[PDB]
Amino acid sequence: SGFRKMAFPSGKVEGCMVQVTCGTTTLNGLWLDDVVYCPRHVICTSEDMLNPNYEDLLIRKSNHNFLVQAGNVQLRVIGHSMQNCVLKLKVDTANPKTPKYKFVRIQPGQTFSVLACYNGSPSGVYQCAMRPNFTIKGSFLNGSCGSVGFNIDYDCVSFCYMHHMELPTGVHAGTDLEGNFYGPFVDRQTAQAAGTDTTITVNVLAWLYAAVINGDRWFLNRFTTTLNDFNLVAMKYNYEPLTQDHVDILGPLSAQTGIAVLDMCASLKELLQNGMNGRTILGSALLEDEFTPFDVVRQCSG
Amino acid sequence: SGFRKMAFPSGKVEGCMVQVTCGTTTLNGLWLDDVVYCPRHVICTSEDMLNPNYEDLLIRKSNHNFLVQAGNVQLRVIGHSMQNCVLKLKVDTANPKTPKYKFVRIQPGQTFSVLACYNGSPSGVYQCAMRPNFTIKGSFLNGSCGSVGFNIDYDCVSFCYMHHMELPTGVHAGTDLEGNFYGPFVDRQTAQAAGTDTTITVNVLAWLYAAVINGDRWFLNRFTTTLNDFNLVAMKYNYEPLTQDHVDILGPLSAQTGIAVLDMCASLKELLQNGMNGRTILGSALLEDEFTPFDVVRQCSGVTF
Ligand SMILES: *[C@@H](CC(=O)OCC)[C@H](C[C@@H]1CCNC1=O)NC(=O)[C@H](Cc1ccccc1)NC(=O)[C@@H](Cc1ccccc1)NC(=O)CCOCC#C
Ligand SMILES: *[C@@H](CC(=O)OCC)[C@H](C[C@@H]1CCNC1=O)NC(=O)[C@H](Cc1ccccc1)NC(=O)[C@@H](Cc1ccccc1)NC(=O)CCOCC#C
């Protein structure tokens, strides 16, 4: 029993974290096989960050301008190239601690673990969700760029995020491991912001199933609803529309609890329209939307 | 910016997790130097676990009854001892991945990272606090016993919890690595109630400081209270008394924000008496009490390990 914001164990990723320096700029890189991946703005200077021409800025660099430190051992760069918004530095040694891995591009509403690092050294691990507006609500300070987000399926690490920027509102933007930003953001020190965020409906429902599994049941009612009638109330409260694919994804949780998805939707509708009345669910006075159906099964199955 | 429930990196601990099997019972152990630590109830059978005499149960075992698996190598048990509620299996090989470590007994209100493990394989990491009633609000399933909790300081891992039990209310009870349970709980298959809990005041204040550092300021006010007047409200709302030691511990955060502790206390008093009026603080509609002042400093200053 119990339900926590649970990240994946971070060791397999800790073994791949390195420090990358160019000029006076230092940030984190991800060392997999004989390649180090890092944000390309490691080649910028303070004045240049406004409208940087990365093609030219990289022309002026040689392999020896890139200092890569794994612990207190220096790796020797023997090639460099740019892929979208990430730099790839080829080094002369493969990382012995390389795990089985893949690069994936995740969809809004999906979750991942972040290993926050500074100067190639890990500082902490936490769980995030790709918001519908393609930001993440992270915890990142100066020096954290190059920190990565990941999921672990068995012993395979699926890297899905590398950190680049903090938006004016305190949320965060970055790229997949092929250097493509999530959302309409660019690696420039310019006026940027995607406001107007929405709640991830299928995640709230999964979390309500988690509550039921854990014995919190006060919000269950006898009523039911249709998908169209639920979705009318949903968009009124800034919830993502619920689709049949979402309903199907919740099949396993519905089966474990005996509660059909549309019955849960009726409970959810009443919560949105009436509040919780000074009550809590799984220790929260808000409806949580950063647990996916898989996160719930993973943590209520082990 | 941003403020998350942040655990320590778990790699140093992952390297110490092993599987311990005794008969049909399998659970997790902690392999440090040439000793494997695990809950002593691994030696129980379904006909014993009610009111077991653990000394008799261990006299009746031998080294070969214990089956210890470190990844894909079998460790040879060469000795066994019991200290309080923790079993100590001496093995023939020292763990090459042993970090600098300490065994520490933590105080209610102190937080730690839990590495939830099954069959000796780490499964996830999350943050917990030792509650005032000496339970922890963990996330554990069958197979999780022997999972440990810990804090890190530079390179030293301070182990403070090993998991043994879930209470009927769904919260958890365990020992320190010296084998002494937190609270009045025992390793017997009996229902033992979590007593009434209280809110960790100093941690709530630390989290309000975290909010200020991250730009949430709406709960601040022009008032300052006295410690006495604050603690009158605290008792009524089932909050721990605030002590001068707590005020001192909050020093660094009061320094960074420029907001004195007793000034912050007047915000906490107002939130307790009037609630939050449909607003949130750091994404929460409740007052969070599982971040310590060090937790705030560590996260908002980028301390690494
Ligand atoms: C990682 C690298 C770094 O520290 O280099 C700078 C010395 C950080 C992580 C950020 C830092 C604060 N919290 C984080 O998560 N990344 C940055 O600092 C990027 C660096 C960058 C270089 C070249 C081209 C693009 C980005 N910049 C930012 O994070 C800025 C982005 C910004 C600035 C002004 C308007 C919109 C967006 N964010 C920032 O300064 C905080 C929020 O902006 C407030 C304002 C105005
Ligand atoms: C770890 C045991 C393990 O890994 O070994 C594998 C065989 C679990 C962790 C529990 C499991 C569910 N979630 C958890 O955190 N520990 C236990 O199962 C202990 C084992 C034990 C053996 C011998 C002596 C003491 C403890 N048992 C429990 O946790 C029971 C305690 C109990 C017994 C009788 C009535 C109430 C509580 N907890 C339990 O069953 C929780 C749900 O039932 C509540 C009721 C009623």
Side-chain angles (χ1 to χ4, degrees), chain A residues 1, chain B residues 25-28 41 44 49 52 54 140-145 163-168 172 186-192:
Chain A
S1 297
Chain B
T25 305
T26 292
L27 52 74
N28 309 277
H41 68 61
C44 291
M49 47 174 225
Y54 282 101
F140 291 119
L141 301 165
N142 285 325
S144 65
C145 290
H163 185 50
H164 293 241
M165 181 160 298
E166 184 170 295
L167 304 189
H172 298 107
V186 296
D187 44 2
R188 310 192 198 130
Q189 286 270 50
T190 70
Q192 334 176 16

CSV table of all heavy atoms in Angstrom, one decimal, chain A residues 1, chain B residues 25-28 41 44 49 52 54 140-145 163-168 172 186-192, ligand 2:
chain,number,residue,atom,x,y,z
A,1,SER,N,0.9,-1.2,0.0
A,1,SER,CA,0.0,0.0,0.0
A,1,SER,C,0.9,1.2,0.0
A,1,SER,O,2.1,1.2,0.1
A,1,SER,CB,-0.9,0.0,1.2
A,1,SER,OG,-1.8,-1.1,1.2
B,25,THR,N,11.3,-18.2,1.9
B,25,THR,CA,11.2,-16.8,2.1
B,25,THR,C,12.3,-16.1,1.5
B,25,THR,O,13.5,-16.4,1.7
B,25,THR,CB,11.1,-16.5,3.6
B,25,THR,OG1,10.1,-17.3,4.3
B,25,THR,CG2,10.9,-15.0,3.9
B,26,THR,N,12.0,-15.1,0.6
B,26,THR,CA,13.0,-14.3,-0.1
B,26,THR,C,12.7,-12.8,0.1
B,26,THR,O,11.5,-12.4,0.1
B,26,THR,CB,13.0,-14.6,-1.6
B,26,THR,OG1,13.5,-15.9,-1.8
B,26,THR,CG2,13.9,-13.6,-2.3
B,27,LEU,N,13.7,-12.1,0.4
B,27,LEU,CA,13.6,-10.6,0.6
B,27,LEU,C,15.0,-10.0,0.3
B,27,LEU,O,15.9,-10.6,-0.2
B,27,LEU,CB,13.1,-10.3,2.0
B,27,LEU,CG,13.9,-10.9,3.2
B,27,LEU,CD1,15.2,-10.3,3.5
B,27,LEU,CD2,12.9,-10.7,4.4
B,28,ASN,N,15.0,-8.7,0.5
B,28,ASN,CA,16.2,-7.9,0.1
B,28,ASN,C,17.2,-7.8,1.3
B,28,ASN,O,16.8,-7.7,2.5
B,28,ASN,CB,15.8,-6.5,-0.4
B,28,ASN,CG,14.8,-6.5,-1.4
B,28,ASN,OD1,15.1,-6.7,-2.6
B,28,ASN,ND2,13.5,-6.3,-1.0
B,41,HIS,N,13.0,-11.3,10.2
B,41,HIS,CA,11.9,-12.2,10.0
B,41,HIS,C,12.0,-13.0,8.7
B,41,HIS,O,11.0,-13.8,8.4
B,41,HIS,CB,10.5,-11.4,10.0
B,41,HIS,CG,10.3,-10.4,8.9
B,41,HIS,ND1,10.3,-10.8,7.6
B,41,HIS,CD2,10.1,-9.1,8.9
B,41,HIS,CE1,10.0,-9.7,6.9
B,41,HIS,NE2,9.9,-8.7,7.6
B,44,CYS,N,11.5,-16.7,9.6
B,44,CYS,CA,10.2,-17.2,10.1
B,44,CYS,C,9.5,-18.1,9.1
B,44,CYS,O,9.7,-18.0,7.8
B,44,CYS,CB,9.3,-16.0,10.4
B,44,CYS,SG,9.8,-15.1,11.9
B,49,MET,N,5.6,-17.1,12.7
B,49,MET,CA,5.5,-15.6,12.6
B,49,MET,C,4.6,-14.9,13.5
B,49,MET,O,4.7,-13.7,13.7
B,49,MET,CB,5.1,-15.3,11.1
B,49,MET,CG,3.9,-16.2,10.6
B,49,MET,SD,3.3,-15.7,9.0
B,49,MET,CE,1.6,-15.7,9.3
B,52,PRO,N,6.9,-15.4,17.3
B,52,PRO,CA,8.2,-16.2,17.2
B,52,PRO,C,9.1,-15.8,18.3
B,52,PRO,O,9.2,-14.7,18.7
B,52,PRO,CB,8.7,-15.8,15.8
B,52,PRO,CG,8.1,-14.4,15.6
B,52,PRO,CD,6.8,-14.4,16.2
B,54,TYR,N,12.7,-15.4,18.2
B,54,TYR,CA,13.7,-15.3,17.1
B,54,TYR,C,15.1,-16.0,17.5
B,54,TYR,O,15.8,-16.5,16.6
B,54,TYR,CB,13.9,-13.9,16.7
B,54,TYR,CG,12.8,-13.3,15.9
B,54,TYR,CD1,11.8,-12.6,16.4
B,54,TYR,CD2,12.8,-13.7,14.5
B,54,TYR,CE1,10.8,-12.1,15.6
B,54,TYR,CE2,11.8,-13.2,13.7
B,54,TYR,CZ,10.8,-12.4,14.2
B,54,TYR,OH,9.8,-11.9,13.5
B,140,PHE,N,5.0,0.4,-0.6
B,140,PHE,CA,5.7,-0.9,-0.5
B,140,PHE,C,4.6,-2.0,-0.8
B,140,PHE,O,3.5,-1.9,-0.4
B,140,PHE,CB,6.2,-1.1,0.9
B,140,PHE,CG,7.4,-0.3,1.3
B,140,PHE,CD1,7.3,0.6,2.3
B,140,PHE,CD2,8.6,-0.4,0.5
B,140,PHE,CE1,8.4,1.4,2.7
B,140,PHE,CE2,9.7,0.4,0.9
B,140,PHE,CZ,9.6,1.3,2.0
B,141,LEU,N,5.1,-3.1,-1.5
B,141,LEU,CA,4.3,-4.2,-1.7
B,141,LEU,C,5.0,-5.5,-1.2
B,141,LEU,O,6.1,-5.4,-0.7
B,141,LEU,CB,4.0,-4.4,-3.2
B,141,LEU,CG,3.3,-3.2,-3.9
B,141,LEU,CD1,3.4,-3.3,-5.4
B,141,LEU,CD2,1.8,-3.1,-3.5
B,142,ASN,N,4.3,-6.6,-1.3
B,142,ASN,CA,4.9,-7.9,-0.9
B,142,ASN,C,6.3,-8.0,-1.7
B,142,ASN,O,6.4,-7.7,-2.8
B,142,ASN,CB,4.0,-9.1,-1.3
B,142,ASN,CG,2.9,-9.2,-0.3
B,142,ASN,OD1,3.0,-9.0,0.9
B,142,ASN,ND2,1.7,-9.7,-0.9
B,143,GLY,N,7.3,-8.4,-0.9
B,143,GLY,CA,8.6,-8.6,-1.5
B,143,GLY,C,9.6,-7.4,-1.2
B,143,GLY,O,10.8,-7.5,-1.5
B,144,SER,N,9.0,-6.3,-0.6
B,144,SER,CA,9.8,-5.1,-0.4
B,144,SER,C,10.7,-5.1,0.8
B,144,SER,O,11.5,-4.2,0.9
B,144,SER,CB,8.9,-3.9,-0.4
B,144,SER,OG,8.0,-4.0,0.7
B,145,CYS,N,10.5,-6.0,1.8
B,145,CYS,CA,11.2,-5.9,3.0
B,145,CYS,C,12.7,-6.0,2.8
B,145,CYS,O,13.1,-6.7,1.9
B,145,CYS,CB,10.7,-7.0,4.0
B,145,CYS,SG,9.1,-6.7,4.6
B,163,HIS,N,13.1,-1.6,5.9
B,163,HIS,CA,11.6,-1.8,5.9
B,163,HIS,C,11.3,-3.2,6.4
B,163,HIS,O,11.9,-4.2,6.0
B,163,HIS,CB,11.0,-1.6,4.5
B,163,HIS,CG,9.5,-1.7,4.5
B,163,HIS,ND1,8.7,-1.0,5.4
B,163,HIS,CD2,8.7,-2.4,3.7
B,163,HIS,CE1,7.5,-1.3,5.1
B,163,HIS,NE2,7.4,-2.2,4.1
B,164,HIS,N,10.3,-3.3,7.2
B,164,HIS,CA,9.8,-4.6,7.8
B,164,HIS,C,8.3,-4.8,7.6
B,164,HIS,O,7.9,-6.0,7.5
B,164,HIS,CB,10.1,-4.6,9.3
B,164,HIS,CG,11.5,-4.7,9.7
B,164,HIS,ND1,12.1,-5.8,10.3
B,164,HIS,CD2,12.6,-3.8,9.5
B,164,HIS,CE1,13.4,-5.6,10.5
B,164,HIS,NE2,13.7,-4.4,10.0
B,165,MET,N,7.5,-3.8,7.7
B,165,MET,CA,6.1,-4.0,8.0
B,165,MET,C,5.2,-2.9,7.5
B,165,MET,O,5.5,-1.7,7.4
B,165,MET,CB,5.9,-4.0,9.6
B,165,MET,CG,4.5,-4.2,10.0
B,165,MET,SD,4.3,-4.8,11.7
B,165,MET,CE,5.2,-6.4,11.6
B,166,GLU,N,3.9,-3.3,7.1
B,166,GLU,CA,2.9,-2.4,6.8
B,166,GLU,C,1.8,-2.5,7.9
B,166,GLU,O,1.4,-3.6,8.2
B,166,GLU,CB,2.2,-2.6,5.5
B,166,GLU,CG,1.1,-1.6,5.1
B,166,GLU,CD,0.7,-1.8,3.7
B,166,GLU,OE1,1.5,-1.5,2.7
B,166,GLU,OE2,-0.5,-2.1,3.4
B,167,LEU,N,1.4,-1.4,8.5
B,167,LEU,CA,0.3,-1.4,9.5
B,167,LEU,C,-1.0,-1.5,8.8
B,167,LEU,O,-1.2,-1.3,7.6
B,167,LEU,CB,0.5,-0.1,10.3
B,167,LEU,CG,1.8,0.1,11.0
B,167,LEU,CD1,1.8,1.2,12.0
B,167,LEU,CD2,2.3,-1.2,11.7
B,168,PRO,N,-2.1,-1.8,9.6
B,168,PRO,CA,-3.4,-1.9,9.0
B,168,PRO,C,-3.9,-0.6,8.3
B,168,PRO,O,-4.7,-0.7,7.4
B,168,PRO,CB,-4.3,-2.2,10.2
B,168,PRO,CG,-3.4,-2.9,11.1
B,168,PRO,CD,-2.1,-2.2,11.0
B,172,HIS,N,3.8,2.5,7.3
B,172,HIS,CA,4.8,1.5,7.4
B,172,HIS,C,5.7,1.7,8.6
B,172,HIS,O,5.8,2.8,9.2
B,172,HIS,CB,5.7,1.6,6.1
B,172,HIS,CG,4.9,1.3,4.9
B,172,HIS,ND1,4.5,2.2,4.0
B,172,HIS,CD2,4.3,0.1,4.4
B,172,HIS,CE1,3.7,1.7,3.0
B,172,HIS,NE2,3.7,0.4,3.3
B,186,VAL,N,6.8,-3.9,16.5
B,186,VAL,CA,7.5,-5.1,16.7
B,186,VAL,C,7.3,-6.0,15.4
B,186,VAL,O,6.4,-5.8,14.7
B,186,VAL,CB,7.1,-5.9,17.9
B,186,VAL,CG1,7.4,-5.2,19.2
B,186,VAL,CG2,5.6,-6.3,17.8
B,187,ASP,N,8.3,-6.9,15.1
B,187,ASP,CA,8.2,-7.7,14.0
B,187,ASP,C,7.5,-9.0,14.4
B,187,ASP,O,8.0,-10.1,14.5
B,187,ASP,CB,9.6,-8.1,13.4
B,187,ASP,CG,10.6,-8.4,14.5
B,187,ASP,OD1,10.3,-8.4,15.7
B,187,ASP,OD2,11.8,-8.7,14.1
B,188,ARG,N,6.2,-8.8,14.5
B,188,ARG,CA,5.2,-9.9,14.7
B,188,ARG,C,4.0,-9.7,13.8
B,188,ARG,O,3.6,-8.6,13.6
B,188,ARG,CB,4.8,-10.0,16.2
B,188,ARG,CG,5.9,-10.0,17.2
B,188,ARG,CD,5.6,-10.3,18.6
B,188,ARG,NE,6.6,-9.8,19.5
B,188,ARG,CZ,6.4,-9.1,20.6
B,188,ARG,NH1,5.2,-8.8,21.0
B,188,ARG,NH2,7.5,-8.7,21.3
B,189,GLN,N,3.5,-10.8,13.3
B,189,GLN,CA,2.4,-10.7,12.4
B,189,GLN,C,1.1,-10.5,13.2
B,189,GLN,O,0.2,-11.3,13.3
B,189,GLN,CB,2.2,-12.0,11.5
B,189,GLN,CG,3.3,-12.1,10.5
B,189,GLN,CD,2.9,-11.5,9.1
B,189,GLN,OE1,2.4,-10.3,9.1
B,189,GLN,NE2,3.0,-12.2,8.1
B,190,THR,N,1.1,-9.3,13.8
B,190,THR,CA,0.0,-8.8,14.5
B,190,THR,C,-0.4,-7.4,14.1
B,190,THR,O,0.5,-6.6,13.6
B,190,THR,CB,0.3,-8.8,16.0
B,190,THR,OG1,1.2,-7.8,16.4
B,190,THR,CG2,0.8,-10.2,16.5
B,191,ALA,N,-1.6,-7.0,14.3
B,191,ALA,CA,-2.1,-5.6,14.0
B,191,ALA,C,-1.6,-4.7,15.1
B,191,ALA,O,-1.8,-4.9,16.3
B,191,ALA,CB,-3.6,-5.5,13.9
B,192,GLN,N,-0.8,-3.7,14.7
B,192,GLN,CA,-0.3,-2.7,15.6
B,192,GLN,C,-0.6,-1.3,15.1
B,192,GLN,O,-0.2,-1.0,14.0
B,192,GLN,CB,1.2,-2.9,15.8
B,192,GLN,CG,1.6,-4.3,15.6
B,192,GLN,CD,3.1,-4.5,15.6
B,192,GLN,OE1,3.9,-3.7,16.2
B,192,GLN,NE2,3.6,-5.6,15.1
C,2,LIG,C1,7.9,-7.4,3.4
C,2,LIG,C2,8.0,-8.9,3.6
C,2,LIG,C3,8.9,-9.6,2.5
C,2,LIG,O1,9.4,-8.9,1.6
C,2,LIG,O2,9.2,-11.0,2.5
C,2,LIG,C4,8.6,-11.8,1.5
C,2,LIG,C5,8.1,-13.1,2.1
C,2,LIG,C6,6.5,-7.0,3.7
C,2,LIG,C7,6.1,-5.5,3.4
C,2,LIG,C8,4.5,-5.3,3.5
C,2,LIG,C9,3.9,-6.3,2.4
C,2,LIG,C10,2.7,-5.5,1.9
C,2,LIG,N1,3.1,-4.1,1.9
C,2,LIG,C11,4.3,-4.0,2.9
C,2,LIG,O3,4.9,-3.0,3.2
C,2,LIG,N2,6.4,-7.2,5.2
C,2,LIG,C12,5.3,-8.1,5.7
C,2,LIG,O4,4.6,-8.7,5.0
C,2,LIG,C13,5.3,-8.3,7.3
C,2,LIG,C14,6.2,-9.6,7.4
C,2,LIG,C15,6.4,-10.1,8.8
C,2,LIG,C16,6.8,-11.5,9.0
C,2,LIG,C17,7.1,-12.0,10.5
C,2,LIG,C18,6.9,-11.0,11.6
C,2,LIG,C19,6.4,-9.6,11.4
C,2,LIG,C20,6.2,-9.1,10.0
C,2,LIG,N3,4.0,-8.5,7.7
C,2,LIG,C21,3.1,-7.3,7.6
C,2,LIG,O5,3.5,-6.3,7.1
C,2,LIG,C22,1.7,-7.3,8.1
C,2,LIG,C23,1.6,-7.1,9.6
C,2,LIG,C24,0.2,-7.4,10.1
C,2,LIG,C25,-0.1,-8.8,10.6
C,2,LIG,C26,-1.5,-9.1,11.1
C,2,LIG,C27,-2.6,-8.0,11.1
C,2,LIG,C28,-2.3,-6.6,10.6
C,2,LIG,C29,-0.9,-6.3,10.1
C,2,LIG,N4,1.0,-6.2,7.4
C,2,LIG,C30,-0.2,-6.4,6.6
C,2,LIG,O6,-0.7,-7.4,6.4
C,2,LIG,C31,-0.8,-5.1,6.0
C,2,LIG,C32,-2.3,-5.4,5.4
C,2,LIG,O7,-3.1,-6.0,6.4
C,2,LIG,C33,-3.6,-5.1,7.4
C,2,LIG,C34,-4.7,-5.8,8.2
C,2,LIG,C35,-5.5,-6.3,8.9
